[PDB]
Scaffold this active site. Structure first.
Site, PDB file in Angstrom:
ATOM      1  CG  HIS A  77      -0.206   8.583   1.852  1.00  0.00           C
ATOM      2  ND1 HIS A  77      -0.823   7.380   2.153  1.00  0.00           N
ATOM      3  CD2 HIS A  77       0.572   8.971   3.061  1.00  0.00           C
ATOM      4  CE1 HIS A  77      -0.694   7.038   3.220  1.00  0.00           C
ATOM      5  NE2 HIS A  77       0.066   7.770   3.968  1.00  0.00           N
ATOM      6  CG  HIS A  95      -0.502  -0.558   2.422  1.00  0.00           C
ATOM      7  ND1 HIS A  95      -0.657  -1.993   2.964  1.00  0.00           N
ATOM      8  CD2 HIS A  95      -0.065   0.114   3.342  1.00  0.00           C
ATOM      9  CE1 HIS A  95      -0.214  -1.779   4.189  1.00  0.00           C
ATOM     10  NE2 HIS A  95       0.209  -0.617   4.551  1.00  0.00           N
ATOM     11  CB  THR A 127      -4.148   8.469   6.937  1.00  0.00           C
ATOM     12  OG1 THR A 127      -2.818   7.946   6.695  1.00  0.00           O
ATOM     13  CG2 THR A 127      -3.924   9.842   7.596  1.00  0.00           C
ATOM     14  CB  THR A 128      -3.511   3.297   6.413  1.00  0.00           C
ATOM     15  OG1 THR A 128      -2.635   2.672   7.474  1.00  0.00           O
ATOM     16  CG2 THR A 128      -2.823   4.060   5.309  1.00  0.00           C
ATOM     17  CG  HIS A 178       2.067  10.594   6.956  1.00  0.00           C
ATOM     18  ND1 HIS A 178       1.085   9.770   6.503  1.00  0.00           N
ATOM     19  CD2 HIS A 178       1.532  11.745   6.706  1.00  0.00           C
ATOM     20  CE1 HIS A 178       0.203  10.596   5.907  1.00  0.00           C
ATOM     21  NE2 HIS A 178       0.504  11.886   6.123  1.00  0.00           N
TER      22      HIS A 178
END
Length: 255
Positions: free
Chosen positions: A92, A60, A194-195, A115
């Site tokens: 991201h 991911h 955020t995941t 991040h």
């Protein structure tokens, strides 16, 4: 879960009900509404003694991991109480330069978002902190397209090595200091991961000032695969979650 049309962000709620919780991230930073808070102390980033171990393709995004057995790479000050240890950093990004960041500023989207994940040393390990409201501190840095970022070239060149899901490569002597903007002005608010599992244990610290990266740096990110080696090729792009409702929370400014 993933970011496709059938397992994307709008489906996470099924497996992770907290998806529609009260302190979900990311959100849009309305700069006109954010409150300048004078009681905000300057950020304190001690990464001179950081120790990188490796980079991996988790399916991911790609993660650079750090040795967090000691107070080697730490974050303190700001709105933070206690010491927070660097455990990892990931990105991201989007399919185009017009998309990719998670957090938005006045509805503006950046090419990508960095991040830096840190955990409260009071809690002893990462897994216990993600059980606390003040368990994590995430340093968010925006990436715009312009000039190359020398400090990011080392990451860029090892991508070839972890193109698919499950791959990893040794990645020592990597200094995160090379990824920081000149200014440490920030925005802060309480939110979550955020995941998935999207646990609501994070204190977000979004830097004001973006870092510029060249077109060919960002391009190398888009060459990554969500899939595992030997499966149809699905490029790793748009691995960003859409802005969530603030819901009463207040966003504060250190400037």
């Amino acid at each position: 879960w993933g970011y496709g049309k059938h397992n994307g962000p709008e489906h996470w709620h099924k497996d992770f009900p907290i998806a529609k919780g009260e302190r979900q991230s990311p959100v849009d930073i309305d700069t006109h509404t954010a409150k300048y808070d004078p009681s905000l102390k300057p950020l304190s980033v001690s990464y001179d003694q950081a120790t990188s171990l490796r980079i991996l393709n988790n399916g991911h995004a790609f993660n650079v991991e750090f040795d967090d057995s000691q107070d080697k790479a730490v974050l303190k000050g700001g709105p933070l109480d206690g010491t927070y240890r660097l455990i990892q950093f990931c990105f991201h990004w989007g399919s185009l330069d017009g998309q990719g960041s998670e957090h938005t500023v006045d509805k503006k989207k950046y090419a990508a978002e960095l991040h830096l994940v840190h955990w409260n040393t009071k809690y002893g390990d990462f897994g216990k902190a993600v059980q606390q409201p003040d368990g994590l501190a995430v340093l968010g840095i925006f990436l715009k397209v312009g000039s190359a970022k020398p400090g990011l070239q080392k990451v860029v060149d090892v991508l070839d090595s972890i193109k698919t899901k499950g791959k990893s490569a040794d990645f020592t002597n990597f200094d995160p200091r090379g990824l920081l903007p000149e200014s440490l002005d920030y925005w802060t608010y309480p939110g979550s991961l955020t995941t998935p599992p999207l646990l609501e244990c994070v204190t977000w610290i979004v830097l004001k000032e973006p870092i510029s990266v060249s077109s060919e740096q960002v391009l190398k990110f888009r060459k990554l695969n969500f899939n595992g080696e030997g499966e149809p090729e699905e490029l790793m792009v748009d691995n960003w979650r859409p802005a969530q409702p603030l819901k009463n929370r207040q966003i504060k400014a250190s400037f």
